[PDB]
């Protein structure tokens, strides 16, 4: 992975920028040392209570002379301590403000330039650059990578500096107050980073093992959901359910172990930090007995070294964000500092005013930059006189278009020169070059705006009258005036779709506005019907007036009209001259003449569900039984600690017997270790409980989901919100993430309720008033913690919603770069881009200020809490209310309690995302379709007859109930005879074939098979005797023998039936010939096949089950040569003795069909055989007339 030098990355920072960064970082440093200072002050605080405990403990000394020496002393010490706390806090709000504010600011300002210059630099690039580069990733790079470099030069490094400042402040204060203790603790430190470092590698080892573990089931998951039509139709729902399931009990059972080891990681972390607590206090408390360190000093250094330690662990992502922001900056600055071969932005060439317009190509050798290996033009020589029109032909290769492309100087030739008049095309400014060159491409392209605006894109300073005139010159004025909004009518991608001819004509006009003296037509008439081609070419021929035109037309119809016809054999020009010369020479021209004669949309919709999801995992009670208890234990562990820490520092603050100072000390210290041991037990138990549950719950769930997915209707798979990829992603992720809302959430809620719940009881008994204070301040701070992330993500989505404006402009500009580069107008699109960006950047100031005041409001009172609680508590202890140790207990219990609930909240997966990934699962499972392929009811007669009779049957698609497809059309087919369907297009050419296979239910009316109604029959058994052949036959990546046997399921097909079905599908020839027999895989994983053979296999598939009803729906549309012969030849020998229905557009193999039904609109208007309908001279006469 690549990365920029740190110095290079801030290149677009200026005066004010460096200023902001420096001021900010400076405030970040001092914000950093605020916490260690806080620690020291805390030590100095506890030292003071330690003095008043011991004297009033032992016996009785002076009753009236204690209130003066103890009570009066402490208040005098706390009135100043308060000033310290509060002082530091008040400073902290300011300096934190400066930090986030300035860093966010300077970052934003930089980024604004960065994105702009990235865009301009993308525009600057020639097309040769867009050949070698994917435009999709480039356009997303302008949004993703720039937003990615925004993060890493902003708040993140501010916090990095705060963090390193806390590291240095903490270790400095550490060693200053305490030489030894800090070295003890720092001695303990390398055993936690060595522990966190091996356990991350362990969890991450299984994480990527899982990705390619489930991807075996995901394969057959997308394989099924893609070919789902061919699945339900061959009823392989059972087999595919099984097949999918066999790859589940191998890839989540792999996950079980990983869940366990990650749980043991957590356990070991806890055991280790608790070991650290134990050892540190065992040292320090025995150290305060020898009267070396004070009790408060031990606290000071333990806490400042500890805080200084976790500083690193909360600097890690802040420095990581800086790192990969450099790696993203690489790609962007590469383009910005890249100057192309064709610029194409500034003028350095000439701008002839003659301007003549004589073309010349001398010895042109050229090859595309994507594939230098293959040479395109070899010694290309071609002159074009003024006003003369030259057509390019020969059907050689790309070369044709290449010349056109070379003419507007998209690329440059490898050898040889392209000269307009006396000067080379390279000696003239490129902007002015494409201003004097107009172009019409094979595919028209209109930008999303008004027609007027699309026209402006050819020339900016054009009056409305010039516009109208230009439109008229394009024979386009007519249909534009017929539009509802005239010249303000929307076009392009979204809104108001226009035909290809009109769309092309507007482009013709656009080009015409430029008034070029040279005109290039690359397959202008191509890809158009014969009725619009006339009008379009009418505009073109009038556009060729006064202009030097070179035209390439696949249709040589409009070619003869040219002055000079130039043929292409290979890379060289061979035959050149007038039409008659090339006809007489019988060249290549003569040859050709004779031969041609959704992500948000998903999660928005579902309502529900509050805790019903737990019913899903309820299949295993034991695991949850152990689980919940284990969490109550690990949850009571935390309040325990706060008590035990308060008894450690209590035995030296509340005085008493010195001989018992040790006995207590080592007891509590050792006790901490015990509290760690048990802590390692819970987490080893939890991952064996919830861990397996949530994983079992995963497997089973997926199974259920997949099953239900096969139950569904065909209408559901027509739903624009349910795609093979979206479905398989619903199966892959949401199905696994469901475990978040079950066990994990019980763990969380129980650990939290155990912690803050019991801790609040204890802090309530050890203090009435102070507890009331903390259960008041703490929630208020917690509320601020929510709003902090509310106003953070809140104006994070609002900022992207105003940024989509820029996104659209850039997108439209990039996706059609190859088009805009021809109309120049690159700088215009840049201008649009900046104009779009001027609104979010004006909101960067307010943004930075907001993040400032928010971060500062949350962070300020994080010190004012200590300020309040320790002042009120001192107020307690000094008076008759007791004591201080209890004050410290209430504080630690409630505060680290509330902190612990936060960390427990951060451990488990996101409950919101879990629930919304759960509701899709539960809805998908409990989903009952109309047509149930799983039902075991049904007639199942012995009657092998098989008469299809549609009566009435009015049907319209549920996906889009607009313009009903079937309007109650009726027909009937008896046994052996073959129906045929004739109409303008599909619907209901295919709709019938679908309704007989019962993919949909017609609104009113009924279709009968034999004497019985379809709806009365068994659903599955109905398709058991119906073979189906679609336009594009799909096979399964399993094997050939299975593909063939896939036709008749629930039965042992074996060698015999497969060879029998192979031999009449005539495919048996292709089988032995190609190594090897029946074991070969189709397709794209094994050997590739042509459509013909694959469809032959497909027929052989629909032939195994011995169907009494064939359904042929536009069988082969892409099959040519003598391949379509053997296909229908194999079709004809299996058609006899079978009820068949054929839909084709061929109309050549329908003359031999038994019944021919001409369906139009929503009914049947013609009926009978071929010659009968033909002699009827209706619409069948007019449709079979286009066969010449
Ligand atoms: C200044 C520090 C001493 C302060 N500790 C406490 O406030 C505390 C003292 Se016992 C305790 N927390 C409980 C007990 C019940 C284990 N543990 C957790 O809540 C917990 C669950 Se995951 C986790 N921590 C992670 C890592 C393990 C990944 N680490 C921290 O969050 C962290 C970083 Se600094 C710090 N904590």
- Residue 545 near residue 532, CB atoms below 8 Å: no
- Asked whether the CA dihedral 326, 332, 334, 336 is positive or negative, the reply is negative
Find out whether 499 is annotated in a ligand binding site. Answer: no
Mutate to test the pocket of ligand 1, among 267, 313, 678, 903 (most ligand atoms within 8 A of CB): 903
- Residue 27 near residue 629, CB atoms below 8 Å: no
Rounded to the nearest angstrom, the distance between the alpha carbon of 269 and the centre of ligand 1 is 9
Residues whose CB is less than 8 angstroms from the CB of residue 1135 and which lie 6 or more positions away in sequence, other chains included: 978, 1110
Closest ligand 1 atom number to CA of residue 904: 21
Rounded-to-integer distance, Cα 885 and Cα 649, Å: 8
Rounded-to-integer distance, Cα 389 and Cα 1131, Å: 52
Locate 303 and state its tokens: 């806490």
Q: Which helix (H) or strand (E) holds 787?
A: helix 769-801
Q: For residue 620, what are the CA distances in angstroms to 690, 706, 745? A: 10, 21, 16
Task: DSSP for 360-371, please give it.
Answer: EEEEEEE--SS-
Evaluate whether 1-178+295-345+803-842 and 185-292+598-765+881-934 have a shared fold: yes
First-to-last alpha carbon distance for the chain, in angstroms, is: 62
CATH classification code of 185-292+598-765+881-934: 1.20.1560.10
What pairs with residue 1013 in β-bridges? 1008
Categorise residue 1036: left if φ over 0, alpha if ψ from -120 to 50, beta otherwise: beta
b/e 1141-1166 (16+ beta carbons within 10 angstroms → b): bbbbebbeebeebebbbbbeebebeb
- Determine if ligand 1 sits within 6 Å of the CB of residue 270: yes
Rounded to the nearest angstrom, the distance between the alpha carbon of 1071 and the centre of ligand 1 is 67
Closest by CA to 1045, choosing from 1090, 1022, 1089, 1078, is 1078
- Residue 130 near residue 818, CB atoms below 8 Å: yes
Helix and strand numbers (H, E) in the chain are: 46, 21
What pairs with residue 439 in β-bridges? 520
Rounded-to-integer distance, Cα 711 and Cα 52, Å: 78
Q: Which CATH number fits domain 359-595: 3.40.50.2000, 3.40.50.300, 3.40.30.160, 1.20.1250.20?
A: 3.40.50.300
- Determine if ligand 1 sits within 6 Å of the CB of residue 698: no
Locate 524 and state its tokens: 């202008």
Cis link prior to 1083 (omega < 30° from 0)? yes
Closest ligand 1 atom number to CA of residue 755: 15
- Residue 103 near residue 21, CB atoms below 8 Å: yes
- Residue 462 near residue 456, CB atoms below 8 Å: yes
| Cα torsion through 17, 22, 28, 31, rounded to 10 | -120
Mutate to test the pocket of ligand 1, among 277, 756, 900 (most ligand atoms within 8 A of CB): 900
- Provide the 3-class DSSP secondary structure of residue 1012: strand
Residues in the chain: 1188
Rounded to the nearest angstrom, the distance between the alpha carbon of 984 and the centre of ligand 1 is 73
Rounded-to-integer distance, Cα 1166 and Cα 869, Å: 93
Locate 700 and state its tokens: 């089973």
- Determine if ligand 1 sits within 6 Å of the CB of residue 641: yes
- Determine if ligand 1 sits within 6 Å of the CB of residue 269: yes
Q: Whose CA is nearest to atom 12 of ligand 1?
A: 900
- Residue 731 near residue 706, CB atoms below 8 Å: yes
Q: Tell how strand 437-440 and strand 518-522 pair up.
A: parallel
- Provide the 3-class DSSP secondary structure of residue 381: strand
- Determine if ligand 1 sits within 6 Å of the CB of residue 103: no
Ranges of each domain in the chain: 1-178+295-345+803-842, 185-292+598-765+881-934, 359-595
Technique of determination: X-ray
Find out whether 983 is annotated in a ligand binding site. Answer: yes
The CATH H-level superfamily of 1-178+295-345+803-842 is ABC transporter type 1, transmembrane domain (1.20.1560.10)
- Provide the 3-class DSSP secondary structure of residue 694: helix
- Determine if ligand 1 sits within 6 Å of the CB of residue 309: no
Model resolution, angstroms: 4.3
Rounded to the nearest angstrom, the distance between the alpha carbon of 900 and the centre of ligand 1 is 7
Exposed / middle / buried, residue 734 (Cβ in 10 Å: 0-12, 13-18, 19+): buried
Closest by CA to 511, choosing from 484, 477, 539, is 539
- Residue 1034 near residue 1057, CB atoms below 8 Å: no
Closest by CA to 40, choosing from 284, 312, 311, 294, is 294
Q: DSSP state, 425?
A: G
Rounded-to-integer distance, Cα 123 and Cα 811, Å: 12
Q: Whose CA is nearest to atom 24 of ligand 1?
A: 903
Find out whether 873 is annotated in a ligand binding site. Answer: no
- Residue 1006 near residue 952, CB atoms below 8 Å: yes
Q: Which helix (H) or strand (E) holds 423?
A: strand 423-424
Closest by CA to 305, choosing from 183, 168, 170, is 170
Rounded-to-integer distance, Cα 1150 and Cα 1115, Å: 13
Q: After which residues is the chain broken (C to N over 2.5 A)?
A: 597
Rounded to the nearest angstrom, the distance between the alpha carbon of 279 and the centre of ligand 1 is 17
């Amino acid at each position: 992975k690549p990365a920029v030098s740190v110095l290079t990355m801030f290149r677009y920072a200026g005066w004010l920028d460096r200023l902001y960064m420096l001021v900010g970082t400076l405030a970040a440093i001092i914000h950093g040392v605020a916490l260690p200072l806080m620690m020291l002050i805390f030590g100095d605080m506890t030292d003071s209570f330690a003095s008043v405990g011991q004297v009033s403990k032992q016996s009785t000394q002076m009753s009236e002379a204690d209130k003066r020496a103890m009570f009066a002393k402490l208040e005098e010490e706390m009135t100043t301590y308060a000033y310290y706390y509060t002082g530091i806090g008040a400073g902290v709000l300011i300096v934190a403000y400066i930090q986030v504010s300035f860093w966010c600011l300077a970052a934003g300002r930089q980024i604004h330039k960065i994105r702009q210059k990235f865009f301009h630099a993308i525009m600057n690039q020639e097309i040769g650059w867009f050949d070698v580069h994917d435009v999709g990733e480039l356009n997303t790079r302008l949004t993703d990578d720039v937003s990615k470099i925004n993060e890493g030069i902003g708040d993140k490094i501010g916090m990095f500096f705060q963090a390193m400042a806390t590291f240095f402040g903490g270790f400095i204060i550490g060693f200053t107050r305490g030489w030894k203790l800090t070295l003890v603790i720092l001695a303990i430190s390398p055993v936690l980073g060595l522990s966190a470092g091996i356990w991350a590698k362990i969890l991450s080892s299984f994480t990527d093992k899982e990705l390619h573990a489930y991807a075996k089931a995901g394969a057959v998951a997308e394989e099924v959901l893609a070919a789902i039509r061919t699945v339900i139709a061959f009823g392989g729902q059972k087999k595919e359910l099984e097949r999918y399931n066999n790859n589940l009990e191998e890839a989540k059972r792999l996950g079980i172990k990983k869940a366990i080891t990650a749980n043991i990681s957590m356990g070991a972390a806890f055991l280790l930090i608790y070991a650290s607590y134990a050892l540190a206090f065992w040292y320090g408390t025995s150290l305060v007995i020898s009267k070396e360190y004070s009790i408060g000093q031990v606290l000071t250094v333990f806490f400042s070294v500890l805080i200084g330690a976790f500083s690193v662990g909360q600097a890690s992502p802040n420095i990581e964000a800086f790192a990969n922001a450099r790696g993203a900056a690489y790609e962007v600055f590469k383009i910005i500092d890249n100057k192309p071969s064709i610029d194409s932005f500034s003028k350095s060439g000439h701008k002839p005013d003659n301007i003549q317009g004589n073309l010349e190509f001398k010895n042109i050798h050229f090859s595309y930059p994507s594939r230098k290996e293959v040479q395109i033009l070899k010694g290309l020589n071609l002159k074009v006189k003024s006003g003369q029109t030259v057509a390019l032909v020969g059907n050689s290769g790309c070369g044709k278009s290449t010349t056109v492309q070379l003419m507007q100087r998209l690329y440059d030739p490898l050898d040889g020169m392209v000269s307009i008049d006396g000067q080379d095309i390279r000696t003239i400014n490129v902007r002015y070059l494409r201003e004097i060159i107009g172009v019409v491409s094979q595919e028209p392209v209109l930008f999303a705006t008004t027609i007027a605006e699309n026209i402006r894109y050819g020339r900016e300073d054009v009056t409305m009258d010039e516009i109208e005139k230009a439109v008229k010159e394009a024979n386009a004025y007519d249909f534009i005036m017929k539009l509802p909004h005239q010249f303000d009518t929307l076009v392009g991608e979204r809104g108001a779709q226009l035909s290809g001819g009109q769309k092309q004509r507007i482009a013709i006009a656009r080009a015409l506005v430029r008034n070029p003296k040279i005109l290039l037509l690359d397959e202008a008439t191509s890809a158009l019907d014969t009725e619009s081609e006339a009008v379009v070419q009418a505009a073109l021929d009038k556009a060729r007036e006064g202009r030097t035109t070179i035209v390439i037309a696949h249709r040589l119809s409009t070619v003869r009209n040219a002055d000079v016809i130039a043929g292409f054999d290979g890379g060289v020009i061979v035959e050149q001259g007038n039409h008659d010369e090339l006809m007489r020479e019988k060249g290549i021209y003569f040859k050709l003449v004779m031969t041609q004669t959704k992500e948000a949309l998903d999660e928005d919709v579902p309502p529900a569900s509050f805790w019903r999801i737990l019913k899903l995992n309820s299949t295993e009670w034991p695991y949850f039984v152990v689980g919940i208890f284990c969490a109550i234990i690990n949850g009571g562990l935390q309040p325990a600690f706060s008590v035990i820490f308060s008894k450690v520092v209590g035995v030296f603050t509340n005085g008493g017997p010195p001989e018992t100072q040790r006995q207590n000390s080592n007891l509590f210290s050792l006790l901490f270790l015990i509290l760690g041991i048990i802590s390692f037990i819970t987490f080893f138990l939890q991952g064996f409980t919830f861990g397996k549950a949530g994983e079992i719950l995963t497997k089973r769930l997926r199974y259920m989901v997949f099953k239900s997915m096969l139950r569904q209707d065909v209408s559901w798979f027509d739903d624009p919100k349910n795609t093979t990829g979206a479905l398989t992603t619903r199966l892959a992720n949401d199905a696994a993430q469901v475990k978040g809302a079950t066990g994990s959430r019980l763990a969380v809620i129980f650990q939290n309720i155990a912690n803050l719940g019991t801790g609040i009881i204890i802090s309530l008994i050890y203090g009435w008033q102070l507890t009331l204070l903390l259960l008041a301040i703490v929630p208020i701070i917690a509320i601020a913690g929510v709003v902090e992330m509310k106003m953070l993500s809140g104006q994070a989505l609002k900022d992207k919603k105003e940024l989509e404006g820029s996104g659209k402009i850039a997108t439209e500009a990039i996706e059609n770069f190859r088009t805009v580069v021809s109309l120049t107008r690159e700088q215009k699109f840049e201008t649009m881009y900046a104009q779009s960006l001027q609104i979010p950047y004006r909101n960067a100031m307010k943004k930075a200020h907001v993040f400032g005041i928010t971060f500062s409001f949350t962070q300020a009172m994080m010190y004012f809490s200590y300020a309040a609680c320790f002042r009120f508590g001192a107020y307690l202890v000094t008076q008759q209310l007791m004591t201080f140790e209890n004050v410290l207990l209430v504080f630690s219990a409630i505060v680290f309690g509330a902190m612990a609930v936060g960390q427990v909240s951060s451990f488990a997966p996101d409950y919101a995302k879990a629930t919304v990934s759960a509701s899709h699962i539960i809805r998908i499972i409990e989903k009952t379709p109309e047509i149930d392929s799983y039902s075991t009811q049904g007639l199942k007669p012995n009657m092998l007859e098989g008469n299809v009779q549609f009566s009435g049957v009015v049907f319209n698609y549920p996906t889009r109930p607009s313009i009903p497809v079937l309007q109650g059309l009726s027909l009937e087919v008896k046994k052996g005879q073959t129906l045929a369907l004739v109409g303008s297009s599909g619907c209901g050419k295919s709709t019938v074939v679908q309704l007989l296979e019962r993919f949909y239910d017609p609104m009113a009316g009924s279709v009968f098979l034999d004497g019985k109604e379809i709806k009365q029959l068994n659903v599955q058994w109905l398709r058991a005797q119906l073979g189906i052949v679609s336009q594009e036959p799909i096979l399964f990546d399993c094997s050939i023998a299975e593909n063939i046997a896939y036709g008749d399921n629930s039965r042992v097909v074996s060698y015999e039936e497969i060879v029998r079905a192979a031999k009449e599908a005539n495919i048996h020839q292709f089988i032995d010939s190609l190594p090897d027999k029946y074991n070969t895989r189709v397709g794209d994983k094994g050997t590739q096949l042509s459509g013909g053979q694959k469809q032959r296999i497909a027929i052989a598939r629909a032939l195994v089950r011995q169907p009494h009803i064939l359904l042929l729906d536009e069988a082969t549309s892409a099959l040519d040569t003598e391949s379509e012969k053997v296909v229908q030849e194999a079709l004809d020998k299996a058609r006899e003795g079978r009820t068949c229905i054929v839909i084709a557009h061929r109309l050549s193999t329908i003359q031999n069909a038994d019944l021919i039904v001409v369906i139009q609109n929503g009914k049947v208007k013609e009926h009978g055989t071929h010659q009968q309908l033909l002699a009827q001279k209706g619409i069948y006469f007019s449709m079979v007339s286009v066969q010449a």
